[PDB]
Ligand binder design. Sequence first.
Ligand SMILES: CCCCCCCC/C=C/CCCCCCCC(=O)OC[C@H](COP(=O)(O)OCCN)OC(=O)CCCCCCC/C=C/CCCCCCCC
Ligand SMILES: *P(=O)(O)OCC(C)(C)[C@H](O)C(=O)NCCC(=O)NCCSC(=O)CCCCCCCCCCCCC
Ligand SMILES: CC(C)NC(=N)NC(=N)Nc1ccc(Cl)cc1
Ligand code: SF4
Ligand code: SF4
Ligand code: SF4
Ligand code: SF4
Ligand code: FES
Ligand SMILES: [Mg+2]
Ligand SMILES: [Zn+2]
Lengths: 97, 215, 96, 103, 124, 176, 114, 230, 112, 208
Amino acid sequence: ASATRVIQLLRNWASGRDLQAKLQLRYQEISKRTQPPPKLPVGPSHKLSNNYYCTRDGRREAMPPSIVMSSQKTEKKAVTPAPPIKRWELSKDQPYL
Amino acid sequence: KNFSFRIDELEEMLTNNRIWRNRTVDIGVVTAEDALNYGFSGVMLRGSGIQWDLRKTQPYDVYDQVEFDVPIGSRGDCYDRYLCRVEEMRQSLRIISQCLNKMPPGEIKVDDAKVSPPKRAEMKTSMESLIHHFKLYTEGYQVPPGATYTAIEAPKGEFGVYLVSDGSSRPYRCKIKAPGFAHLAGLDKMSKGHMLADVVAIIGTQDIVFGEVDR
Amino acid sequence: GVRTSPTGEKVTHTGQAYDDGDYRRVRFSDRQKEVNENFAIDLIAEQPVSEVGSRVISCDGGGGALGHPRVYINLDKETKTGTCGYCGLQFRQPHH
Amino acid sequence: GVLRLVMELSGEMVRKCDPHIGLLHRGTEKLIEYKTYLQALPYFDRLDYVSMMCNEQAYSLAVEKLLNIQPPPRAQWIRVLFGEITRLLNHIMAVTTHALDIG
Amino acid sequence: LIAVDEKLDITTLTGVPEEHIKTRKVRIFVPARNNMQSGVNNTKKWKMEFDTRERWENPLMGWSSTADPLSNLVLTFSTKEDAVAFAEKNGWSFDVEERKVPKPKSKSYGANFSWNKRTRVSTK
Amino acid sequence: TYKFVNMREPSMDMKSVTDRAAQTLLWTELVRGLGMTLSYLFREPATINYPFEKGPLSPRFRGEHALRRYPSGEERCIACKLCEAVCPAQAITIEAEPRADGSRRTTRYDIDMTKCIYCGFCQEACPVDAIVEGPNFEFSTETHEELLYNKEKLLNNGDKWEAEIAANIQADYLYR
Amino acid sequence: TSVKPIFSRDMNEAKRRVRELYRAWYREVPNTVHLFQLDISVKQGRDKVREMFMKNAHVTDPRVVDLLVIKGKMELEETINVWKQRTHIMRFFHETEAPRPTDFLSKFYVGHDP
Amino acid sequence: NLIEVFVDGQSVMVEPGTTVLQACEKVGMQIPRFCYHERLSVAGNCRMCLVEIEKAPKVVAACAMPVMKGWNILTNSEKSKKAREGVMEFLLANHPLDCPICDQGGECDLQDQSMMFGSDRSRFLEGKRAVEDKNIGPLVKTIMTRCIQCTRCIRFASEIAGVDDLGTTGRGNDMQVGTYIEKMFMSELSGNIIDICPVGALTSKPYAFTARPWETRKTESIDVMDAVGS
Amino acid sequence: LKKTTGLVGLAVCETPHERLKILYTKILDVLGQIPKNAAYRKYTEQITNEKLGMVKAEPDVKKLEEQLQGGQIEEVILQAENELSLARKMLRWKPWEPLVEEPPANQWKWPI
Amino acid sequence: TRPTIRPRNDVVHKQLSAFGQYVAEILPKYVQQVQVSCFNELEIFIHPDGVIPVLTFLRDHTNAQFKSLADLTAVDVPTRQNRFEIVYNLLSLRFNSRIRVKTYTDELTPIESSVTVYKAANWYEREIWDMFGVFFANHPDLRRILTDYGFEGHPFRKDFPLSGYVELRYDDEVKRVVAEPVELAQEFRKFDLNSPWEAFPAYRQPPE
Ligand SMILES: CCCCCCCC/C=C/CCCCCCCC(=O)OC[C@H](COP(=O)(O)OCCN)OC(=O)CCCCCCC/C=C/CCCCCCCC
Ligand SMILES: *P(=O)(O)OCC(C)(C)[C@H](O)C(=O)NCCC(=O)NCCSC(=O)CCCCCCCCCCCCC
Ligand SMILES: CC(C)NC(=N)NC(=N)Nc1ccc(Cl)cc1
Ligand code: SF4
Ligand code: SF4
Ligand code: SF4
Ligand code: SF4
Ligand code: FES
Ligand SMILES: [Mg+2]
Ligand SMILES: [Zn+2]
């Protein structure tokens, strides 16, 4: 910035942290407003051969929902929608604040 | 780089302030069962203590390739919710750092010109690309018939879309489930035995956006 | 080619001018009528005719991806000149 | 600014709260029904206007799940990065406006 | 489980004004195939649409103004019976047009080359 | 993984009790907040001197609409109505007829700027890059009517901002 | 043919509920006039309530009557709790709408509407 | 009597002499087509209707192939999809980029069938052909660069209008549909060549550039200009 | 032993094993009033017996919680109470009779 | 690998099918149909009178702890006799799963309110009533929630016009806001966008 040395000491002591390292204002450390022209890559389907759309058509592979039980139409174990969720583990980086 | 200091400056003014603790502590306390059943999601559940988060339980996009912690409250009040939000900001900073480190190269849209519009050069040099651009920007791609309910962990909780398609290029039905709707419905439960300022604090900690509430 | 209508009102490039008995001219009182002075038809007529030695010529409007979609024009009929209809540009095959 | 609250108090306590929502209802769902899938994206962009890209991501995920297609990895990483940026925005707004209401 | 023999009249519940309830004649029809295209996927469901009303020009900008709320209202029904039931329970007047399917035709490529018939073509 | 934010029992030893009692009687955290605010007071403000200084923008910025021309002067629009097809707000009204020389050109092109949501779909759908969103954003008016642009107004905007619009399109046409 | 009831098994209970709703609306007109500072008289409010009740007199299905009285109770609840403004109460009285003629000659003169 | 055929494994009874395309119509499947019109003679040249029989090694043209007893028609087979993609690839390879300036834009059978039964990409790196436009009267505007040489206008002209003035002059890729001489195709039924043309090669001159199909509202009425009551 | 269960409003139970045994017994004896052929009775009896055996064969609280895979043992107790209440309600409802009524001909058909 | 096609989870599909069979066997009196979509979503179609028992079972059962009510909405399909389609989305945190329950209902048929089972059902059913006209029998407080006071009609029905029937403006004669019949300066332009060619052969209906 451009503050006086005494002002910098006062602001560092009042805040308790060195504010010169972390400045809210951007001083020439941002990217240039003018950048060189890019060259974007092509996707995986930009192939001149072996690229028939019938083999890579996501929409046409959709199906109507499968009927599991319909009213019109050895013991069995009880089942759940999914295996029970495993309990979370306390983080080792900083378990408590 | 220059944001953790901002978070620390924010915390210096509110976290340990006795006035803020008086205004937020033990106000709007909601139990875990009541929060759930009233239909709560996200920060409300985490403050009440329920270890639930969509980004970790039902990952979407590449959220399963990043490491972050889920803040958990203990008393289920405004102060705990505020602490959870601050820690969520820090964890989002960590996730941003990881994404910046591990950004991959490649294309930015699906290479399927029947869904994603082709590039302008291809459209101006290719007949198929021109036809697909024309059709996509006039009629729109058709979606197979069906109905889906997809929910994500938006910053205010579980934000869900129930989309019903009849096979046309326009959606037949679109229900929008906003997290703030259930929270504002439960506002009356949380405001029992409090005052006007406490009601204001409860609304603030519920973080209601009336745009998403009303739609 | 901005021409003035009988009522003293400028005529736009689309041949628009309110009639004598039209009440809608009141909106221009104490104000002005927005008319673009440059006429695209007049300018494209002022543009010359390019001559190339081929039966089929490709036009993309100039600039590549900044122009219009590339089209091919057949320069066979000597009665007229082949006109790219995106940019309205005339091409011709040498005769004499 | 679009909230109407009917409160029954007992001296100082609050005995009943009734939020009268509906002051910002615009028939977004019916408008979406009348639009196409691409033309309905800004409607989600304008639903929760502190988490705009989060709403866009949710709608995009729904439409992609219906279409049975998959975004490229770079697109997924960009979506996650900007979702986290939008989460920072939303949390900042929430905490700061909470404090602004309380002092 | 009470018993009643009414005709399922929800006119007083729909909230539509009596003018638009009693002065509207809807058309229950299968849309005709667009002659500019050969596809027949738009001629499979019955459509219910209302009668056209006045549309004038805006004095400013010359836009197409209107005063008929039901001008853009088009409903899709699977069967004529369902469409007629909906129209009857909503109380609007209606006229129903029967479906016009294309009749089957006899086509033979060998008929283009006939020894003694007029179906012989002069070109390919 | 997860973590606890407010689960930490303070110690009950005499030293900690005395420290907490001193914090209660002597407003230590309040003094800390005052010091932070004083530091922010002595920091430099982040205010720009508008209108003499302008906030940063990008070539992708969407503002006032404009209709462009070819270098030959012929207008780029070919009356294709993809504008009207793709506009989410239905803010574009287009009417066309063959020109005197037989070209496919518009006779009416109106944009309702009070209905437009400035979403930028119209310039994505243009096959000839005719309609663009110019960088101008200071076109506030004192009446509702002045925001109902027509073909003449849009062509005037294009002629007025052609240099800047062309520069922005040149700078950001490789990403599209 | 056979359907489940809402509130009334037959028309007598529906008529009883209609009478109760009419009593409730009748006893609230002066209070509504006083609270909203309406410029109308109490007699005009009573006549408007009577007119609103009489425009559904042709309903014969008990379920439709039950839904109508439920909606009427909702509207009365909105009025008693002063949730509505003077705006809606006066919206009941079409006051700024021009009188549309109901004769063939006038309808022919004004425009194409039937 | 009626013979039994199979479409995608579903049995259907059809009259003798019925074609694969009509059997698919009976079962509800619409085979893609460019040159086939039910009210015209069969051409079989566009090759867009190629379908696969269950055990046959070569695909057949559904518009001109009578069904045999016991045949199973695989409409959604891999071979059928690849054949449709190839035919559409050829058509769009030689077609011009005129969709925005074309009156057939939103109601084009080439665009719709390209988006349904076609590929989304082009590997054609060569230069396209250009054909000089003809003049056949003030009612029909001809931009013959968009013609796909489907010969619908020739067959319609001959059979329906009794006017044998349209035909194909040339050979190979240079084959052109036209009148050769500058004769104008004038008849009492000359706009139906505008209707039946699947592309914008023949378009209504009075209607040129005025509007787009998605904007217009369709009202079904009858014609009052004579006693036919069309 | 634990100071807090971690959930607001969920108090710590000092005697979890006895409470679990009582709740499981009350669930089992209520299900005796449901017909044996009912599909609901078999599954809930099976799961209750599977969980009841774990309680009787595990004295350690942490090991019992690990075996049950139902989270906190207080959560397990609350789930047992909810299951007992549901069993009573289902006994009142009797949802084992055949279907009340089939839907109309085309009711769930989609798209339509 | 296929980059442009979404992956499929046969394990989750089988688990959802098994749970659907389980619930159908447990509740034969109300469950009419069970479906599993190809993107792994379980749907249960039940009789409208079994809403309370089915929801109570799916909330309190040990293997079916769907404690959270994710959403509650209705879909209007005029062609059906029972046009309204009430949909319940339930979330189970214990097993990390979601379920969908569907119910049919016409204009005049009330439904039992689920406020006893789930508390969000209060406002969700209020919104459903306000927007469609579906009535819930045992609701603590049923009234309009989103629409304006005195609003006539249910906007989300497919037979309700987009712009409504009335509009608001300030009238200087009466010094208040008034409601007058709607009259648009520019009419909404209806676009016919459906293509005349079938796009998905998998969903093709019988020719009837
Ligand atoms: C003029 C110079 C300015 C320099 C200072 C700069 C400005 C500093 C001002 C910042 C203050 C911010 C505003 C403060 C508003 C709130 C103040 C406040 O909260 O104080 C209340 C505070 C605690 O309240 P709670 O914790 O909320 O109650 C819970 C009880 N368990 O109570 C108080 O009374 C504060 C104490 C004030 C008196 C302190 C006396 C200390 C003890 C004196 C011992 C000496 C006795 C003398 C005998 C000596 C024998 C030898
Ligand atoms: P007797 O039983 O013969 O009574 C005669 C009638 C015709 C009422 C019969 O009871 C009868 O058979 N009626 C037909 C069925 C029926 O009861 N219909 C009535 C429907 S209830 C209804 O419509 C009530 C809703 C009206 C709410 C009015 C709102 C008040 C507006 C006030 C505006 C200004 C006030 C300040
Ligand atoms: C709907 C959300 C995104 N918006 C906000 N208005 N939250 C809010 N508490 N913000 C705020 C701003 C200024 C004032 Cl004076 C008082 C409150
Ligand atoms: S920016 Fe969007 S809303 Fe505005 S005119 Fe363009 S397409 Fe329409
Ligand atoms: S998209 Fe371009 S060419 Fe088409 S109408 Fe708009 S400005 Fe004109
Ligand atoms: S005929 Fe069809 S494919 Fe050819 S330019 Fe016209 S719209 Fe495009
Ligand atoms: S002009 Fe049209 S109808 Fe005639 S052959 Fe060409 S594409 Fe077919
Ligand atoms: S439709 Fe059969 S080959 Fe053309
Ligand atoms: Mg044509
Ligand atoms: Zn050109």
